[PDB]
Amino acid sequence: SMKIDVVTIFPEYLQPVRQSLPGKAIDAGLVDVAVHDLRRWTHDVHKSVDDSPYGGGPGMVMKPTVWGDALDEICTSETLLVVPTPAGYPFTQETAWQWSTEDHLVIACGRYEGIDQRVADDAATRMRVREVSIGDYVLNGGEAAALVIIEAVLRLVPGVLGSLLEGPSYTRPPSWRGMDVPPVLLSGDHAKIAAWRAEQSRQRTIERRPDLL
Amino acid sequence: SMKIDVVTIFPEYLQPVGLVDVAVHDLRRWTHDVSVDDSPYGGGPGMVMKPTVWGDALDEICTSETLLVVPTPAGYPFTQETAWQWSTEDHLVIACGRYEGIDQRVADDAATRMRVREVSIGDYVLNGGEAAALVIIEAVLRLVPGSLLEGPSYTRPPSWRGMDVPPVLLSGDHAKIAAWRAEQSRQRTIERRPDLLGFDSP
Ligand SMILES: N#Cc1c(-c2ccc3ccn(Cc4ccc(CN5CCCC5)cc4)c3c2)n[nH]c1N
């Protein structure tokens, strides 16, 4: 039973998550995902969420007063606050496993150059906070990272969404555009098949991810 | 100028996506059955997407100039270097798998005609290629013409809940500010991503 709250200035971006949630899991109270527009917590008629960086430099920084109010309303002491950032600890499958047993995740999606650091620092004095990155590339903001995190975590929660590299997979037809499925797979020698797959995995890992070796 | 075509059995998922155009195609539009997947040869759990439907879709969508991108957990890593490389391409086609993935012959056949890249966006498991497509598109499109971890950023007010913006950032001394920011970045990189500086991962 997990609740996920996402806070963002682009709530429409989180539409796919709601699209991918089976009715059965929601009706069984296994999961609830809520998306909140950050501008609900702005102070001014112009609904301002950003401001110039101290110390100068390019871009803008999201305002701590707006984020502080939003998180004050949404979080509790039991919340795991997740903050996507290109400067974060790596989000991995181990992370996803750990978070799949949480009661309450709140994902704070930044834009511009990110969120004033005092927001996370203040939150960390009364709840668990995790600054994480989903990969070594640069995005426009936290929303795409939130989609990835939500999917990776929820697929590990029983009945919610419906090392070496894996080798190639094949299905019907047995021959297609001049390429035959590897005969060993049709041999009925299941120890040999397992050994073939293991060697394929080993070779692919060497070629594509030698860092794992 | 870049064109991006995404092929998926879940077009609705791609909704978050004139120098660039993005088009989303339902893979089932290329079926003749009143089924896109079947059980794996050699056995194993789950289902595999059949090559037949993919071949027909890609025949119609791709040319020999196309870069065919195939998200897969067993892919080469997609990094910022990859994003720079792809940013000057004329035509990206992203083939999004579901179930246990796509029959390997799809990528193998395509590679006789065009350039093919099997890539992974990170070391975690998704339910299919769509979320990876969204990440790849976002990372690439922000680089289309027309190291160290970043340190912390701050903005107004200079004191908030009794927490002060680091005084150096208020000082106006460009040299001391640059130095402090370099130190913060160093500290953050050592703590969070020591591999980037050639140290062992924790
Ligand atoms: N997870 C995750 C992420 C994100 C991510 C997550 C959250 C936000 C909020 C805003 N942005 C955009 C941005 C863009 C450029 C810079 C400048 N830096 C200078 C050197 C590098 C970046 C800073 C922020 C975000 C990006 N990007 N990549 C990931 N794996």
Ligand SMILES: N#Cc1c(-c2ccc3ccn(Cc4ccc(CN5CCCC5)cc4)c3c2)n[nH]c1N
């Ligand atoms: N990029 C990227 C990706 C993906 C991704 C990309 C494309 C597809 C198409 C289908 N799936 C789902 C899937 C899930 C698990 C397995 C492994 N098997 C499970 C049981 C035994 C092995 C195979 C496929 C995909 C996942 N995941 N993580 C990334 N960084």
